[PDB]
């Protein structure tokens, strides 16, 4: 929550607040850099290059 | 991440209280929340 | 007649495994994973089913 | 008696042309015209109807 002024933190299947209360079997962090307009493309079932 | 219950390598910063048995309590086991009585079980679970 | 009762009860019990379009068939999991607006849509599905 | 049976089946058939609050009564149209997460809600609405 201290990462950048206006970070977009979008959770599917969970809540942003509830992550601290949960146990996760297998966790993977996938890091990349894209254009801002292409950020919305990073979501389940979206269309884009 | 997978929330399907299994051995959980990654967990949130939650302090674990003592384990009380044979009494009606609320319980939170690795994110599994419920209400009931925990008793020593004779079930022959596999170690995994 | 006895059978027609028992099966029915078993069916009822088995219908507790249906997600009914929710993320989970467990109410506690839905409440623990989601904030109140999203949980309401899922608990509504489960309760209606 | 025959009429009742014959009529009831038609009702069932006619209930295949009901949106039940969704955008369309055709599943493929809903899948094509909506995002898969958004489409699944309408599809489950049709399924429960």
- Any C CB within 8 A of A16 CB: yes
Resolution value, angstrom units = 2.6
The span from the CA of B16 to the CA of B19, in Å, is 9
Chain A residues closer than 8 Å to D37 by CB? 12, 44-45
**Does residue B23 come out as left (phi exceeding 0), alpha (psi in the -120 to 50 range) or beta?**
beta
Solving technique: cryo-EM
SS3 track for chain A: CCCCCCCCCCCCCCCCCHHHHCEECCCCCCCCCCCCCCCCCCCCCCCCC
Phi first, then psi: what are they for A24, rounded to 5°?
Answer: -120, 130
Q: Do B13 and A20 touch (CB under 8 A)?
A: yes
Q: Do C34 and A18 touch (CB under 8 A)?
A: yes
> Is the separation of the CB atoms in B22 and B37 below 8 Å?
yes
Radius of gyration of chain D (CA): 14
Q: How far is D33 from chain A (nearest CA, A)?
A: 12
């Amino acid at each position: 929550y201290n990462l950048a002024p206006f970070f977009t933190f979008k959770c599917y299947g969970v809540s942003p607040t509830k992550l601290n209360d949960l146990c996760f079997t297998n966790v993977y962090a996938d890091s990349f850099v894209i254009r801002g307009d292409e950020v919305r493309q990073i979501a389940p079932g979206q269309t884009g290059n | 991440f997978e929330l399907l219950h299994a051995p959980a390598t990654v967990c949130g910063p939650k302090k674990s209280t003592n384990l009380v048995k044979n009494k009606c309590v609320n319980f939170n086991f690795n994110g599994l929340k419920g209400t009931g009585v925990l008793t020593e079980s004779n079930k022959k679970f596999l170690p995994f | 007649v006895v059978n027609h009762n028992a099966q029915a009860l078993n069916t009822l019990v088995k219908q507790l495994s249906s997600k009914f379009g929710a993320i989970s068939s467990v109410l506690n999991d839905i409440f623990s994973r989601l904030d109140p607006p999203e949980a309401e849509v899922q608990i509504d599905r489960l309760i209606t089913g």
